[PDB]
Amino acid sequence: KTVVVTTILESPYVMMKKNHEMLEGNERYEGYCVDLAAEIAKHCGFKYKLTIVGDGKYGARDADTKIWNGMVGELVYGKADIAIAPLTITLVREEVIDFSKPFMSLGISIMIKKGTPIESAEDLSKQTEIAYGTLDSGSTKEFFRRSKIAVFDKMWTYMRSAEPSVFVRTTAEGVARVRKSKGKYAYLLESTMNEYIEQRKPCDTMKVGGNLDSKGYGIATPKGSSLGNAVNLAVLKLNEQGLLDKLKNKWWYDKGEC
């Protein structure tokens, strides 16, 4: 049977092709994860259908209902068989779903509009003229919410109460906000995305400072899935074969416009 793959529209991982309207099924999309999905399906020998997560979220647990949303939720509730996307491996998620060994290593980073007086997280936490936030329902927000280290704790105190909200529904929303904020907004996102955007027109943003942490993205499957073991070994094989590095260069810098 065809494996239902849940993913998210997030460049350069998954994007609709220029001529998607005249295309069908998986042919409508392109990106790092689209290529990854094809490679995995081939090595594990299965047919699949790419589907875009309904609520457009990565995955967080509602504190009140305890119900998971996003791709994590689609896996938890059996709406999808596997998630192939820039989904971060975290403790709370690992408790409800399975992750393969990472196919990409990254960390939380700072995105600024070129020229803003900020070079590090400590710099952001020591000022108020420049607002900053993170994506909603994700691992980055959880990071600051659950951080006991001085700098990040203070940043969270400011962000969780900030009015208007400094949080955004999608990476694209955060990037747009930085660009149109005349430098009065900094966005906290994973280095992978920061580095990608930094290489795209109008080439008006840049990553500053070192990453705040070190983690990875993993292919996720529901607990007790029969694809879990194989997919995990497939990821390792692809990394060692050099495919993952090949794909990283293909979608990040070979297509860079800055």
Nearer to its own copies, 102 or 222 (CB): 102
Is the bond leading into 202 cis (omega within 30 degrees of zero)? yes
* Binder among 68, 143, 156, 251 for its own copies (CB under 8 A): 143
* Token reading at 151: 């700098």
* Binder among 21, 64, 240, 257 for Zn ion (CB under 5 A): 64
* Distance in Å, CB of 213 to its own copies, minimum: 7
Residue 249 lies near its own copies (rule: CB under 8 A): no
Contact predicate 59/76, CB 8 Å: no
DSSP β-bridge partners for residue 110: 188, 208
Q: Which does 215 bind (CB under 5 to 8 A by kind): its own copies, Zn ion, none?
A: its own copies
* Binder among 12, 73, 102, 174 for its own copies (CB under 8 A): 102
Give the length of the chain.
258
Q: Beta-strand (E) ranges in 81-137?
A: 82-83, 97-99, 104-106, 108-113, 131-134
Q: Is 102 labeled as ligand-binding?
A: no
Query: How far apart are alpha carbons 205 and 151 in whole angstroms?
Result: 23
* Binder among 32, 99, 185, 251 for its own copies (CB under 8 A): 99
Residue 62 lies near Zn ion (rule: CB under 5 A): yes
* Token reading at 112: 């600024």
Residue 91 lies near its own copies (rule: CB under 8 A): yes
Q: Is 105 labeled as ligand-binding?
A: no
Backbone angles phi, psi at 4, to 5 degrees: -85, 115
Nearest to 192 by CA among 83, 32, 29, 51: 32
Q: Which does 62 bind (CB under 5 to 8 A by kind): its own copies, Zn ion, none?
A: Zn ion
* Token reading at 188: 């906290």
Residue 199 lies near its own copies (rule: CB under 8 A): no
Residue 216 lies near its own copies (rule: CB under 8 A): yes
Residues 6+ apart with CB under 8 A from 166: 131, 132, 133, 134, 159, 185
Query: How far apart are alpha carbons 4 and 177 in whole angstroms?
Result: 34
Residue 24 lies near Zn ion (rule: CB under 5 A): no
Residue 147 lies near its own copies (rule: CB under 8 A): yes
Residue 172 lies near its own copies (rule: CB under 8 A): no
- The residue ranges that bind its own copies (CB under 8 A) are 89-91, 94-95, 99, 101-102, 105, 143, 146-149, 213-216, 218, 232-233, 236-237, 239-242, 244-245
Query: Binding site membership for L-glutamate: which residues?
Result: 86, 88, 93, 139-140, 190
